[PDB]
Amino acid sequence: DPLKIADQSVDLNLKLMKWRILPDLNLDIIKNTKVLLLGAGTLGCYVSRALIAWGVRKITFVDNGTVSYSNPVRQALYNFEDCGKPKAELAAASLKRIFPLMDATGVKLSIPMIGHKLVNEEAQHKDFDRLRALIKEHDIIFLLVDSRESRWLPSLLSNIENKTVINAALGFDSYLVMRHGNKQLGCYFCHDVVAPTDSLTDRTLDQMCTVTRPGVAMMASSLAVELMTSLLQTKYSGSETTVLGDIPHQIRGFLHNFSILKLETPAYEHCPACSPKVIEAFTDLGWEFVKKALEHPLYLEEISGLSVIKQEVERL
Amino acid sequence: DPLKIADQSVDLNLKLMKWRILPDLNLDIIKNTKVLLLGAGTLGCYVSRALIAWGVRKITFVDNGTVSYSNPVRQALYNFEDCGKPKAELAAASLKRIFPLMDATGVKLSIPMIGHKLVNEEAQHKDFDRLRALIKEHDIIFLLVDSRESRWLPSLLSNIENKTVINAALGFDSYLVMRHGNKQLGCYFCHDVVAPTDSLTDRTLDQMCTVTRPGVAMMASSLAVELMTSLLQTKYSGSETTVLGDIPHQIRGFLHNFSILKLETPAYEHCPACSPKVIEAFTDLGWEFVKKALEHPLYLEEISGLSVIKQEVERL
Ligand SMILES: [Zn+2]
Ligand SMILES: [Zn+2]
Numbered sequence: 001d002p003l004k005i006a007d008q009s010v011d012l013n014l015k016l017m018k019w020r021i022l023p024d025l026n027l028d029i030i031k032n033t034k035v036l037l038l039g040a041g042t043l044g045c046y047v048s049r050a051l052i053a054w055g056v057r058k059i060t061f062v063d064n065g066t067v068s069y070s071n072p073v074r075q076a077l078y079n080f081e082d083c084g085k086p087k088a089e090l091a092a093a094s095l096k097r098i099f100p101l102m103d104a105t106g107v108k109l110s111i112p113m114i115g116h117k118l119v120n121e122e123a124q125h126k127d128f129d130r131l132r133a134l135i136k137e138h139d140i141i142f143l144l145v146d147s148r149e150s151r152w153l154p155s156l157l158s159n160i161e162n163k164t165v166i167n168a169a170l171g172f173d174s175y176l177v178m179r180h181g182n183k184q185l186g187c188y189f190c191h192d193v194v195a196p197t198d199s200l201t202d203r204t205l206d207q208m209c210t211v212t213r214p215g216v217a218m219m220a221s222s223l224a225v226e227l228m229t230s231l232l233q234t235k236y237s238g239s240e241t242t243v244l245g246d247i248p249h250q251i252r253g254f255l256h257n258f259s260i261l262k263l264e265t266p267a268y269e270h271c272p273a274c275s276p277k278v279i280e281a282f283t284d285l286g287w288e289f290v291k292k293a294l295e296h297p298l299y300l301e302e303i304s305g306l307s308v309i310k311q312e313v314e315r316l
Numbered sequence: 317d318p319l320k321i322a323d324q325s326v327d328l329n330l331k332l333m334k335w336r337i338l339p340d341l342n343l344d345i346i347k348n349t350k351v352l353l354l355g356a357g358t359l360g361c362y363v364s365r366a367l368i369a370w371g372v373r374k375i376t377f378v379d380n381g382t383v384s385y386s387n388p389v390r391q392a393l394y395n396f397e398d399c400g401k402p403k404a405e406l407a408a409a410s411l412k413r414i415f416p417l418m419d420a421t422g423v424k425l426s427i428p429m430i431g432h433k434l435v436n437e438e439a440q441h442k443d444f445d446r447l448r449a450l451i452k453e454h455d456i457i458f459l460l461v462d463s464r465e466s467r468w469l470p471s472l473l474s475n476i477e478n479k480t481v482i483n484a485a486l487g488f489d490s491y492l493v494m495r496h497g498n499k500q501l502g503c504y505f506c507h508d509v510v511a512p513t514d515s516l517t518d519r520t521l522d523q524m525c526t527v528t529r530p531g532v533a534m535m536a537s538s539l540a541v542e543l544m545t546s547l548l549q550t551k552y553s554g555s556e557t558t559v560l561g562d563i564p565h566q567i568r569g570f571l572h573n574f575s576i577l578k579l580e581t582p583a584y585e586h587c588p589a590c591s592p593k594v595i596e597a598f599t600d601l602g603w604e605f606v607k608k609a610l611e612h613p614l615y616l617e618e619i620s621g622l623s624v625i626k627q628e629v630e631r632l
Contacts, residue, residue: 078414258564
């Protein structure tokens with residue numbers, strides 16, 4: 001039976017990795033990891049391919065988009081004949097074409113961007129609940145959206161549900177891969193991940209630059225998955241390493257000079273996404289809080305305590 | 317017309333990259349570059365996807381293999397339904413499914429490994445001529461084979477035909493990407509690219525390790541293509557940089573500690589692949605030379621002058 005053989009083949013490939021090279025490697029915890037991918041664009045496509053090669057069985061894509069004419073060359077699950085079709089379900093179907101016994105599903109769902117007025121209070125209210133449900137349902141959340149403002153709601157919700165989160169963000173010629181965390185590490189929002197004073201091309205990071213160098217998404221996707229697999233391994237006593245090596249908080253890569261930097265950031269007290277007051281506010285008010293924060297980001301800064309900080313500065 | 321639109325879409329995406337961010341970027345020289353991929357495995361699949369995103373129009377795959385049951389999860393042009401089919405032509409057909417007006421073709425052809433007796437003097441003689449023809453026909457040669465011994469013949473031939481060559485080689489958790497060159501840089505064979513004293517996992521480099529960490533091939537493929545695109549750009553006066561940044565000779569990446577190293581090596585006088593005596597020998601004797609070198613690698617060392625070096629050492 002060909003299908004059974006294709007199954008036995010991939011688990012076997014992975015077990016030979018373990019016994020030939022890394023006997024301490026825990027492969028089951030990788031296979032049984034339920035993965036949610038927020039974004040079925042270039043990152044979602046490459047991340048999913050890396051995950052299935054590592055034997056991940058359950059992957060869920062979330063995307064509200066449609067396959068465009070320019071998409072297939074950059075986004076590695078789509079063909080020319082797919083143009084027009086809904087992305088998420090297509091992505092899932094494409095995975096099952098590679099590996100038929102995958103538990104891959106697509107959900108067509110929008111993620112509200114902070115700083116934008118709501119278009120349909122009710123529709124997006126539903127979508128909000130639905131998003132929270134998917135996040136609670138899964139084990140690892142990959143945030144693979146095109147901009148900072150689509151990152152906020154899923155970050156908050158992932159923190160609320162205590163899920164490990166892995167962000168990837170692209171600029172023209174550099175990328176960021178970071179984990180938020182299950183001395184706390186701190187999320188994408190805790191600190192400026194890029195300074196107003198840095199390079200012009202570095203400021204394209206997470207601004208839906210549609211014109212990144214093709215290689216950026218490939219590098220970022222594979223590091224993100226390699227970071228996940230290492231992270232799932234037990235840590236060594238007195239060491240931030242596992243059988244697979246390091247588990248950095250953040251990885252920044254640059255194509256122009258072929259470099260990679262690792263760095264770490266503590267959780268910030270007035271973070272708009274993970275600060276205790278923002279949690280407290282969400283826990284007390286729910287969607288009513290979220291809705292106000294979404295349409296009025298400055299409200300978020302009153303809650304976080306960031307405004308009171310900015311005001312004690314002004315007062316000097 | 318959908319197809320014409322899909323065409324206009326990708327050239328347009330690339331032109332917006334140029335004018336939004338890098339006005340000096342030469343896109344035509346990338347598009348018109350005839351690319352030969354030696355290997356339609358994991359590297360060939362990922363390299364081709366990166367190339368077409370950069371607008372490369374003509375790609376030729378060369379592989380003697382067949383799609384196996386374990387292949388599709390790691391090798392990104394194949395589906396489960398393709399299992400059994402010949403790889404190279406399948407790879408070409410898969411590219412055209414992504415982007416129909418691609419000039420993509422597959423050639424089923426074996427590359428003889430140095431150190432191995434010939435199985436069919438005549439058949440492989442043909443294949444040798446055919447390989448030389450393909451190399452002369454193309455502009456950039458990517459060496460994406462599974463081991464050192466399959467690298468030798470194409471290296472030699474690429475040097476003979478004065479083609480830019482880009483090698484990628486994988487180990488369990490590290491990779492090497494290098495260009496041979498059009499003070500000469502020196503090829504893959506000029507120096508030990510890994511020492512007998514180094515790590516056990518580092519010695520898996522280019523030994524057809526079938527159990528590399530999935531991310532290794534993704535990283536290596538994208539760097540190799542990003543190296544090619546930069547390399548095709550005019551260099552700045554008094555600087556080893558272009559509009560796209562650096563053009564290192566060699567890039568070594570390591571997953572266990574998420575690092576990348578750049579390094580450079582001069583051409584070696586007694587290289588088995590690029591030394592003047594080996595060139596002279598090939599130019600004088602042709603296939604008769606190649607055949608003897610293939611079955612008897614030690615003959616190669618007499619020719620290169622490497623043996624006389626080893627003997628003056630012994631004599632001390
Ligand atoms: Zn935070
Ligand atoms: Zn050499």
